[PDB]
Ligand binder design. Structure first.
Ligand SMILES: CCCCCCCCCCCCCCCCCC(=O)OC[C@H](COP(=O)([O-])OCC(O)COP(=O)([O-])OC[C@@H](COC(=O)CCCCCCCCCCCCCCCCC)OC(=O)CCCCCCCCCCCCCCCCC)OC(=O)CCCCCCCCCCCCCCCCC
Ligand SMILES: CCCCCCCCCCCCCCCCCC(=O)OC[C@H](COP(=O)([O-])OCC(O)COP(=O)([O-])OC[C@@H](COC(=O)CCCCCCCCCCCCCCCCC)OC(=O)CCCCCCCCCCCCCCCCC)OC(=O)CCCCCCCCCCCCCCCCC
Ligand SMILES: CCCCCCCCCCCCCCCCCC(=O)OC[C@H](COP(=O)(O)OCCN)OC(=O)CCCCCCCCCCCCCCCCC
Ligand SMILES: CCCCCCCCCCCCCCCCCC(=O)OC[C@H](COP(=O)(O)OCCN)OC(=O)CCCCCCCCCCCCCCCCC
Ligand SMILES: CCCCCCCCCCCCCCCCCC(=O)OC[C@H](COP(=O)(O)OCCN)OC(=O)CCCCCCCCCCCCCCCCC
Ligand SMILES: CCCCCCCCCCCCCCCCCC(=O)OC[C@H](COP(=O)(O)OCCN)OC(=O)CCCCCCCCCCCCCCCCC
Ligand SMILES: CCCCCCCCCCCCCCCCCC(=O)OC[C@H](COP(=O)(O)OCCN)OC(=O)CCCCCCCCCCCCCCCCC
Ligand SMILES: CCCCCCCCCCCCO[C@@H]1O[C@H](CO)[C@@H](O[C@H]2O[C@H](CO)[C@@H](O)[C@H](O)[C@H]2O)[C@H](O)[C@H]1O
Ligand SMILES: CCCCCCCCCCCCO[C@@H]1O[C@H](CO)[C@@H](O[C@H]2O[C@H](CO)[C@@H](O)[C@H](O)[C@H]2O)[C@H](O)[C@H]1O
Ligand SMILES: CCCCCCCCCCCCO[C@@H]1O[C@H](CO)[C@@H](O[C@H]2O[C@H](CO)[C@@H](O)[C@H](O)[C@H]2O)[C@H](O)[C@H]1O
Ligand SMILES: CCCCCCCCCCCCO[C@@H]1O[C@H](CO)[C@@H](O[C@H]2O[C@H](CO)[C@@H](O)[C@H](O)[C@H]2O)[C@H](O)[C@H]1O
Ligand SMILES: N=C(N)NC(=N)NCCc1ccc(I)c(Cl)c1
Lengths: 307, 69, 347, 174, 57, 83, 96, 95, 98, 100
């Protein structure tokens, strides 16, 4: 029974990633006064399938270390799917008492796939590009962890389903919209999304490729699902759980679509400029707001329950 | 037109609806039609293990009421 | 270094030591060593050269290894007693590991190899801290765990240090290496008496620190790091040569000078315990140190070495180094023997 | 059997240690330490150390070991030497691997063993606590107490981290 | 060292409350009000004797 | 004072992010001491019964100790209900 | 709004915790008998199994004190089936 | 401590975590709390030289609770004997 | 002792022997130093958790924090060595022989 | 068991996808220092030191449940302020600059 449940999560995640590539292309297209894919299947609905087949029968074009060349994509894709197993939608696949910490711990491991693939590139210049990407990723891990802790001081625990209870009456975006703003931007920078897509930017100044792409786009969906739960909590009715799933899916779709919207709207940061955005802007505010959110429940007598 | 973007969004939305809807219905099927019991702390695990013994069939989700008194 | 940062780093070195000395919990003792080691590395590196980087790295590896062994002893002690109180350990394997860890930190033979190399590679002021202040924290732990220390292990460490320290100094012309090997020998006296009377350990430690500080301060006043450089002192600061002579004879343990006192009292305590062969062997072996102290006095004060013409330019300028506490330290280093009974304050 | 899960994890723990302790290329040594870190978390998890187990992942693996690999790629090795191609590494790896297997064989055969010291071999489950029905995590209560009982621990720890920043900036300025 | 004294299997027998935890949770608040006295007498015994064998009655 | 206001306008123009950070951090340090509600945080935390309330052996000289949970003696949470 | 809801959540936690406190004497009474029954059952089998071991005294304490000592896991489930032991040892840690 | 500043000032810097029978959050007791308490109370104020000999019974009991070596050894004996008899078919275990 | 302590104690010994038997890379010896910490963290956590020493639950975290800070210092020394010679080889750190 | 199954499924699937991704029918018959930059090293180290302070703050949601709130709030703010001081020191010592 449990193995069926795992597959009813793994398979839809990969299908959702496939069709996000179509949605991204069509949303970007219409914001650019054009259409995007509309020939390969009606309204382009077969475009992800054609792309997927094409990439997997392409020539799989020497690695500096075979073990790490293969480890990096397995790590990326395996970790990406793992981040989904504690998500309450409304019931998690695995109900963890410390689910928020688990997601923080697993996400911190994702930078190894960047590091390992840079080592296996066998090229001095690709290793340097990987190290620049790693420095960006760990920099924005700092604010994400501190922002998350600030929010949990209103929730009371590290259990993800408690965020639902915390937002029974009101979305956490209202008491914490300054944190929501930096959290949202931090996720963009964390996933190397525009205007923080410096790996693809700086770089230009088959199956293995597809696998890394699936991992990244799964992370994009997951981060926006996490954002919906963290700040736009949906109400759970235990006798009609599908009502929660519909409302929570719509919010996650809209948050994901706003990632595309933002890509279509702005130029790119310089590397040093996105480092200053973190170390000189977000981190000072995040630290001050962390002190504020430690004090606020105490001074209002609004400390949440431990359980 | 922009509403030709919807079919791809609909497929994506149905793909993301399946995990949550499947988990909830699998939980009811496996737990006698009720929510799966949450036991994050030793006290809740102790009650669940006592429920298993009291059930008479080794299922913590099979409940005995005043009929057993 | 920024002067304010240098002060804060010096205070952190002191704070780490103080934490070790006031702690009743083994974790806080370990933290004190960690904090102390973190703050001392920047003053080993401050002159930025390959020799100072090698010394800082050799020092880091030794102290980090010793701190890991210390934490092992603490955790083994917790497993077999269920408590963290700083006192006798409750497991002989834990006692050996902590004794070995503290011997490594003090640079006792045969864990001594780093002391001459690290001292040579760092500035005089940093060597002054390394060979004096840094002995305080490990010795204060040994002061509290000595009931559970293996007697054979500690006395073997002491005897080896007195031999290695004495022999190692015979081959040295670098003043920092002479002080390093001198330090190793003096540590052996401190630990040899610890099983019998820890008070005498404190007496030896305090007096050693005073004479060691005096010598380093006098080397710093003249910027002398080699024997031959020190041999030019007579033709610049004749008073300094006399002070160096008196202090070296004191570190040699010659009566009627202060440095006789710790050797005198250690021999007494060991004989009260029917230890006769060991104190006699130690006293005779300490003649090795006297030999290479006397060698320095010959080239510094009791003979006049050749000079250089440019030295005349130095005659026209005064000493501007701080020489802080030097007049007090030199008088304590040489003239304290008549006050020996004052050691009871350390009881 | 799953009743020996902690022991099985501990066996894997040792093999990972023999991995990097024989010191292949630091790229592979770093990999061996990461696998041992994950397995070490699993051992801690099975003793009720949920928060402690996840700190190894978050801090030891996601923080310290990431910085180790970052530094290795930048200042030590950029291309790993083929694993076990060196004779001493292969000999040290084989020597440690055989010692572990001989330990594991005997403890499982006799349900005890004396490797210098006496170790029981019935399974670590036997020493576990038999009564637990509190409404909280004891590990969480103990860790949370850092802010009520451990004022002095917070002060010295926080101070040391600030000095860590100051010291490292001094070291590297050169 | 001596022998751990244990009560016989018969001295432990009693009629069980074989209802599930949701039944107990539902009745808990009235149960605490109604059965307070024998319950508190038992808990005093346990915390004073520190021995389950001494509070079987 | 006027020099204080001129300094604040300058930083507000050039570094509004840092000005906001310091203002928020200052409020976090100060407001708990000025808030009339901070005292209830102490009381609510203490009123949460994590472990069992072990009863006292009645020696006949405890008029302030309730005999039954529903007796009047003992702490009341009526202040918490109205909160 | 967050202050009001969290205050209500604290009142709801207290009510939940007081339900546990009401039931704790009953659960404690059951836990005592279950533990003693298991120990007594382990004692019957020891008398049979260690009947002809020279010097063995059945049910002898390993502690000098006569104070009651809480048994560890191997003392209660020492001779029981592996499935029950696994649930008693790792069931809570492994639960979802 | 080498310098007992804590006692001189009355400040508790680290004594609170030195033993497991000290005060704990929510009165959560350690498994060997009663054994540690007995040993500490036996040895209090007489000095470690005397306590090593006179509180040996309390300390041996406490060490048994800590590491459970004798208990595990006894269980090893009973299990080993039971396997022998079952291997010889002389014993059938009850349900 | 319990069976797990055998392997955890063995792991520390393996890493200690690894640390004391240097090869060439200074980084390799730093990894053994952090392996020693890891085995210490696990052994301390197991003892503290099993004994239900509640307040000691924070100790492994403190050990982890301080040991990570020590490792950061060690890594800084390694890069300074690497900047001087172009490698982290310990055979280059032999100037203080004389 | 469930979490172990989930992890094994996720990574086992990832391995399989990599497998077929590398082997499909083709139909054909015929250790120096990497141009070391000190600034990127200091970013990693700074991340590490801030990550260790975050480790110390993670317990805060549980710590707020204490009755010793006076001590707990003072220590929580003290830790965060010291984190801010660390950032302020790095900032004013040009540790956050990418020029030169
Ligand atoms: C019983 C066992 C055997 C006896 C044990 C005795 C232990 C030693 C006792 C302490 C002796 C300290 C030296 C006495 C002072 C002599 C120097 C002096 O007169 O300075 C006057 C001092 C400045 O003299 P100066 O012209 O700069 O010359 C400094 C000397 O060359 C000297 O300058 P310096 O670089 O060598 O530094 C000396 C002084 C720092 O210099 C000072 O400022 C004098 C402070 C001496 C304080 C003495 C306190 C003794 C009572 C303890 C309580 O250090 C201290 O602070 C003392 C600790 O004038 C003052 O400000 C008086 C202090 C006001 C407070
Ligand atoms: C339980 C306890 C834990 C057990 C550990 C199980 C294994 C798990 C791994 C543990 C870490 C092992 C680390 C080994 C390592 O990395 O060292 C590399 C170390 C140096 O690495 P290298 O740079 O590649 O140079 C290789 C040779 O040294 C050649 O370099 P070379 O340039 O010096 O060439 C001349 C050669 C000259 O060789 C000789 O002349 C030796 C002949 C002596 C005859 C007597 O030099 C040497 O052999 C140096 C060693 C001389 C013997 C020292 C006296 C002992 O090479 C070795 O010595 C291999 C020995 C590995 C044996 C491991 C045995 C472990 C037992 C420890 C004692 C526990 C007893 C209980
Ligand atoms: C400034 C532009 C920046 C762009 C950032 C991207 C923003 C995208 C945000 C997407 C989320 C918008 C909300 C979509 C609502 C979807 C339908 C829905 O859920 O309606 C229900 C909601 C009230 O119900 P509920 O969410 O359950 O709140 C109760 C508290 N638990 O009804 C309330 O509406
Ligand atoms: C809502 C406001 C309403 C208006 C009235 C409000 C009044 C109450 C608020 C009072 C607070 C005033 C504090 C303002 C101080 C700002 C000082 C400053 O201007 O620093 C800027 C400067 C860095 O700027 P830089 O880019 O390096 O150089 C300029 C070249 N273009 O100098 C620097 O180096 C930056 C300072 C060092 C970095 C410190 C970072 C702060 C610490 C982070 C945590 C935040 C505080 C605690 C949380
Ligand atoms: C990168 C590879 C991915 C590594 C995955 C790391 C696994 C970490 C899981 C820890 C999450 C957790 O705490 O919960 C899992 C479970 C305990 O569940 P929890 O709710 O926290 O507490 C008990 C019930 N209240 O704890 C368990 O189920 C025990 C699992 C032990 C085996 C894990 C071994 C991992 C070794 C990886 C190498
Ligand atoms: C009793 C013994 C007291 C010893 C006091 C000795 C004071 C230091 C020697 C005075 C000579 C002038 C001087 O300033 O000392 C040198 C040294 C400062 O180093 P410097 O190279 O001069 O410049 C520092 C800027 N980077 O100064 C220092 O850095 C201080 C180093 C000495 C501190 C350790 C003293 C020994 C331990 C005392 C405890 C006694 C028990
Ligand atoms: C009281 C109870 C305790 C008893 C213990 C015994 C304590 C005795 C040691 C006290 C501490 C040493 C203090 C010695 C003070 C030395 C001052 C002195 O005598 O003058 C030195 C002399 C002056 O030279 P200058 O600075 O140039 O001024 C004169 C200008 N032509 O400089 C010179 O001219 C150099 C002359 C060559 C050096 C010859 C050295 C032999 C004389 C040694 C005297 C010191 C004793 C050393 C042994 C002790
Ligand atoms: C997602 C599931 C998809 C299932 C689809 C199953 C279809 C299986 C049949 C695949 C046929 C692929 O067809 C073949 O692919 C390889 C990909 O390198 C191409 O390339 C191959 O041939 C050329 C020469 O022609 C070689 O130089 C090259 O090294 C080799 O890779 C071929 O030019 C193409 O003819
Ligand atoms: C080098 C740094 C220089 C700065 C030195 C600063 C030292 C600060 C010392 C802090 C500890 C002060 O002293 C200690 O404080 C805390 C409250 O604050 C008290 O602790 C109190 O709260 C906890 C919770 O139960 C328990 O420790 C105890 O129950 C209670 O006494 C201690 O009883 C008191 O002894
Ligand atoms: C330098 C090596 C560095 C790696 C260290 C590796 C970890 C070492 C683990 C040590 C833990 C075992 O420590 C050892 O355990 C046994 C178990 O009873 C103790 O007991 C043993 O000696 C005493 C002697 O009176 C008695 O208990 C008994 O004869 C015997 O069992 C030892 O007194 C203790 O020294
Ligand atoms: C660089 C070092 C920086 C260190 C920064 C430390 C800043 C600390 C600022 C606030 C510290 C005290 O903050 C707050 O003050 C008020 C003063 O009435 C205390 O008092 C309040 O709560 C207590 C409960 O304990 C009530 O009994 C009291 O009636 C109530 O007024 C709070 O308990 C405390 O939470
Ligand atoms: N970036 C875009 N949105 N367009 C785009 N060309 N994406 C990449 C195409 C792609 C990659 C993997 C898979 I599986 C699929 Cl189905 C499609």
């Amino acid at each position: 029974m449990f193995m069926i449940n795992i597959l009813m999560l793994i398979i839809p995640i990969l299908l959702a990633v496939a069709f996000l590539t179509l949605v991204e292309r069509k949303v970007l297209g219409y914001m650019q006064l054009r259409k995007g894919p509309n020939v390969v299947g009606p309204y382009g609905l077969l475009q992800p399938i054609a792309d997927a087949i094409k990439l997997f029968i392409k020539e799989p074009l020497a690695t500096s270390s075979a073990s790490m060349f293969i480890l990096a994509p397995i790590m990326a894709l395996g970790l990406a799917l793992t981040m989904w197993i504690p998500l309450p939608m409304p019931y998690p696949l695995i109900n963890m008492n410390l689910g928020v910490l688990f997601m923080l711990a697993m996400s911190s491991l994702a930078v190894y796939s960047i590091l390992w693939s840079g080592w296996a590139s066998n090229s001095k210049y690709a290793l340097i590009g990987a190290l620049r990407a790693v420095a960006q990723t760990i920099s924005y891990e700092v604010t994400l962890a501190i922002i998350l802790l600030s929010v949990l001081l209103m929730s009371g625990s590290f259990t993800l389903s408690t965020l639902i209870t915390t937002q029974e009456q009101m979305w956490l975006i209202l008491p914490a919209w300054p944190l929501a703003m930096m959290w949202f931007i931090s996720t963009l920078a964390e996933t190397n999304r525009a205007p923080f897509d410096l790996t693809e930017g700086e770089s230009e100044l088959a199956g293995p490729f597809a696998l890394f792409f699936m991992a990244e786009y799964a992370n994009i969906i997951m981060m926006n699902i996490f954002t919906a739960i963290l700040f736009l909590g949906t109400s759970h009715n235990p006798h009609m759980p599908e009502l929660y799933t519909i409302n929570f899916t719509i919010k996650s779709l809209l948050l994901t679509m706003s990632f595309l919207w933002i890509r279509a709207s702005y130029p790119r940061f310089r590397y040093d400029q996105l480092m200053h955005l973190l170390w000189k802007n977000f981190l000072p505010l995040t630290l001050a707001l962390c002190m504020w959110h430690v004090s606020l429940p105490i001074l209002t007598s609004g400390i949440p329950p431990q359980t | 037109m922009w509403f030709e973007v919807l079919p791809g969004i609909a497929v994506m939305g149905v793909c993301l609806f399946i995990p949550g809807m499947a988990t909830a219905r699998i939980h009811r099927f496996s737990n006698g039609g009720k929510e799966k019991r949450v036991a994050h702390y030793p006290y809740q695990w102790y009650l669940m293990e006592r429920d298993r013994r009291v059930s008479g069939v080794n299922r913590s989700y099979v409940s005995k009421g005043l009929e057993n008194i | 270094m920024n002067p304010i940062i240098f002060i804060i780093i010096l205070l952190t070195i002191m704070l780490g030591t103080i934490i070790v000395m006031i702690s009743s919990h083994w974790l806080l003792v370990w933290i004190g060593f960690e904090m102390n080691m973190l703050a001392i590395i920047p003053i080993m590196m401050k002159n930025h050269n390959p020799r100072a980087t090698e010394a800082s790295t050799k020092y880091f590896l030794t102290q980090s290894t010793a701190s890991m062994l210390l934490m092992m002893a603490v955790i083994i002690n917790l497993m077999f007693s269920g408590q963290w109180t700083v006192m006798k350990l409750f497991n002989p394997m834990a006692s050996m590991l902590m004794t070995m860890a503290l011997a490594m930190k003090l640079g006792m033979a045969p864990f001594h190899f780093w002391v001459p190399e690290v001292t040579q590679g760092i500035p005089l002021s940093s060597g002054l801290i390394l060979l004096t202040w840094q002995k305080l924290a490990p010795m204060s732990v040994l002061y509290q765990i000595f009931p559970s220390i293996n007697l054979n292990l500690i006395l073997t460490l002491s005897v080896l240090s007195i031999l290695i320290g004495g022999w190692g100094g015979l081959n040295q012309t670098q003043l920092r290496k002479i002080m390093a090997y001198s330090s190793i020998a003096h540590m052996g006296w401190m630990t040899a008496v610890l099983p019998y009377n820890p008070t005498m350990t404190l007496l030896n430690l305090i007096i050693y620190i005073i004479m060691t500080s005096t010598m380093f301060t006098m080397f710093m006043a003249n910027s002398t790091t080699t024997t031959l450089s020190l041999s030019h002192t007579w033709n610049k600061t004749p008073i300094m040569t006399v002070l160096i002579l008196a202090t070296l004879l004191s570190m040699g343990g010659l009566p009627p000078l202060s440095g006789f006192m710790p050797k005198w009292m250690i021999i007494q305590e060991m004989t009260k315990n029917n230890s006769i062969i060991l104190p006699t062997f130690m006293a005779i072996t300490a003649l090795l140190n006297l030999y290479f102290y006397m060698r320095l006095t010959y080239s510094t004060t009791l003979t006049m070495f050749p000079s250089t013409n440019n030295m005349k330019m130095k005659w026209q300028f005064p000493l501007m180094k701080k020489m802080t506490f030097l007049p007090t330290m030199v008088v304590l280093s040489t003239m304290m023997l008549p006050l020996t009974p004052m050691l009871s304050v350390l009881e | 059997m799953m009743l020996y899960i902690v022991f099985i994890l501990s066996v894997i723990f040792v093999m990972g240690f023999v991995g990097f302790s024989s010191k292949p290329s630091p790229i592979y040594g770093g990999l061996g330490l990461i696998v041992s870190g994950g397995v070490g978390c699993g051992i801690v998890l099975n003793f009720g150390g949920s928060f402690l187990g996840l700190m190894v992942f978050l801090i030891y693996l996601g923080g310290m070991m990431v910085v180790f690999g970052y530094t290795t790629a930048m200042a030590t090795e950029q291309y790993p030497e083929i694993w076990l191609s060196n004779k001493a590494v292969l000999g040290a790896f084989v020597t440690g691997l055989l010692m572990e297997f001989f330990m594991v064989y005997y403890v499982l055969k006799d349900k005890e063993v004396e490797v210098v010291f006496e170790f029981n071999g019935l399974g670590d489950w036997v020493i576990y606590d038999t009564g637990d029905s509190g409404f909280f995590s004891e590990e969480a209560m103990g860790i949370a107490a850092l802010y009520s009982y451990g004022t002095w621990l917070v002060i010295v720890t926080g101070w040391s981290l600030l000095i860590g920043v100051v010291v490292i900036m001094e070291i590297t300025r050169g | 060292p001596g022998i751990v004294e244990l009560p016989s299997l018969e001295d432990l027998k009693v009629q069980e409350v074989k209802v599930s935890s949701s039944v107990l949770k539902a009745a808990a608040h009235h149960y605490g009000a109604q059965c307070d006295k024998p319950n508190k007498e038992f808990m005093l015994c346990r915390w004073e004797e520190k021995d389950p064998r001494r509070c079987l009655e | 004072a006027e020099r204080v206001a001129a300094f604040l306008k300058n930083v507000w123009a050039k570094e509004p992010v840092l000005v906001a950070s310091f203002a928020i951090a200052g409020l976090a340090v100060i407001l708990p001491t000025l808030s009339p509600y901070t005292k209830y945080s102490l009381m609510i935390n203490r009123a949460t019964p994590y472990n069992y309330p072990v009863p006292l052996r009645d020696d006949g000289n405890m008029p302030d100790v309730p005999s039954h949970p529903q007796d009047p003696q003992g702490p009341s949470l009526e202040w918490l209900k109205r909160l | 709004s967050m202050m009001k809801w969290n205050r209500e959540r604290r009142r709801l936690q207290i009510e939940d915790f007081e339900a546990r406190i009401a039931l704790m004497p009953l659960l404690q009474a059951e836990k005592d008998r279950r533990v003693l029954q298991m120990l007594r059952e382990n004692l019957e089998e020891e008398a049979t199994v260690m009947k002809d071991v020279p010097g063995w005294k059945v049910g002898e304490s390993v502690f000098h004190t006569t104070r009651w000592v809480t048994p560890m896991m191997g003392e209660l489930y020492g001779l029981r089936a592996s499935e029950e032991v696994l649930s008693a040892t790792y069931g809570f840690i492994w639960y979802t | 401590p080498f310098f007992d500043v804590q006692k001189r000032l009355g400040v508790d810097l680290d004594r609170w975590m030195t033993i497991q029978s000290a005060e704990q959050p929510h009165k959560i007791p350690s498994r060997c709390h009663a054994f540690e308490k007995e040993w500490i109370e036996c040895a209090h104020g007489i000095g470690s030289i005397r306590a090593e000999k006179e509180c040996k019974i309390e300390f041996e009991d406490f060490r048994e609770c800590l590491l459970r070596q004798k208990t595990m050894k006894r269980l090893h004996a009973i299990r080993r004997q039971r396997e022998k008899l079952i291997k010889e078919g002389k014993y059938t275990p009850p349900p | 002792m319990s069976m797990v302590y055998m392997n955890i104690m063995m792991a520390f010994t393996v890493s200690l022997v690894g640390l004391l038997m240097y090869r060439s890379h200074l980084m390799s010896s730093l990894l053994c130093l952090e392996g020693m910490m890891l085995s210490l963290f696990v052994m301390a956590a197991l003892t503290i958790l099993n004994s239900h020493f509640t307040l000691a639950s924070m100790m492994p975290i403190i050990l982890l924090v301080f040991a990570a800070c020590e490792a950061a210092l060690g890594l800084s020394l390694l890069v300074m060595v690497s900047n001087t010679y172009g490698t982290d080889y310990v055979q280059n750190l032999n100037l203080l022989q004389c | 068991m469930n979490l172990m199954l989930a992890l094994l499924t996720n990574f086992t699937l990832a391995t399989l996808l990599v497998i077929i991704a590398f082997w499909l029918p083709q139909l054909n018959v015929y250790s120096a220092r990497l141009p070391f930059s000190m600034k990127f090293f200091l970013v990693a180290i700074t991340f590490l030191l801030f990550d260790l302070e975050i480790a110390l703050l993670l317990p805060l949601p549980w710590a707020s449940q204490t009755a010793n709130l006076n001590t707990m709030l003072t220590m929580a703010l003290f830790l965060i302020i010291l984190l801010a001081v660390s950032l302020a020191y790095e900032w004013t010592q040009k540790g956050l600059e990418w020029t030169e």
